[PDB]
Symmetry: C3
Subunit: 114 residues, 3 copies
């Protein structure tokens, strides 16, 4: 699993330990071992959501499996919860794109997960 968040919230407002918290919570939620969970946070972005420049985030979660209707609802509650608590972003100003990747379409370690 890889989780990326793009946000217009400034760098200074991202708290120490945010990447590790994202890692642990995602390991928990997705089942997958934390050793292979990747996370990318991108602050200070030039964005608008609904035409407004109030705090917002555009995110993506890529996973080999563990993507589905019920699971995705659960991930969003988790991730929106984190973004609201740690970055003060309203959950209704967050979009998260979910990608169910084929193992053959994910490269890692000079090869793929196929």
């Amino acid at each position: 699993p890889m989780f990326i968040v793009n946000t217009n919230v400034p760098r200074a407002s991202v708290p120490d330990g945010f990447l590790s918290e994202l890692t642990q919570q995602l390991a928990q939620a997705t089942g997958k071992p934390p050793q292979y969970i990747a996370v990318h946070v991108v602050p200070d972005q030039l964005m608008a959501f609904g035409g407004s420049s109030e705090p917002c985030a555009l995110c993506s979660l890529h996973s080999i499996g563990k993507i589905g209707g019920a699971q995705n609802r659960s991930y969003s509650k988790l991730l929106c919860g984190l973004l609201a608590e740690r970055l003060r972003i309203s959950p209704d100003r967050v979009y998260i794109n979910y990608y169910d990747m084929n193992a053959a379409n994910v490269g890692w370690n000079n090869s793929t997960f196929a």
Copy 2:
């Protein structure tokens, strides 16, 4: 709908109001309310297009439906049009990836659009 533009054009060359213009025009093009539209512009990128570092752009448009052969041609004309006029990027140095998303795979407001 969410639209992301990555470009090697400098921040100073992004005109005031560009994010609002993208929002308004995407609302018109997709027929969705501007309130749902998210836009993200990323200037000053380290990019090459065809081995050249003249102005270029790599973009994506994520939508739940409203994606298709004819509609995407219409989006490209519109968005290339804006990138040329506002950022002075030649349309033939623009790639736009279109994603037709399932509602179940778009998180928002602690849930999904399903």
Copy 3:
């Protein structure tokens, strides 16, 4: 083909000609003319892999065709190799997302590739 690299490796650690080298290698590897190849490198990123902030990379390769099990393995060896040699990133801290797009879902020059 579009190739994007996101990495926590510093900018100054990205060698001159890395974009050019990416372009030629990708041209050779995909059989596509260098004129069609786009490359995007994003250094200095706030990222973690396996909870660790040691050098790592999150990448994607978008192409119309030329994507599949065997092909993606060869790409992964090629690109991890280039990341290891040029950016000193361990192959086992690299993810590459492969996207096989329909020509109709790639915008370019006021239209699509369809």
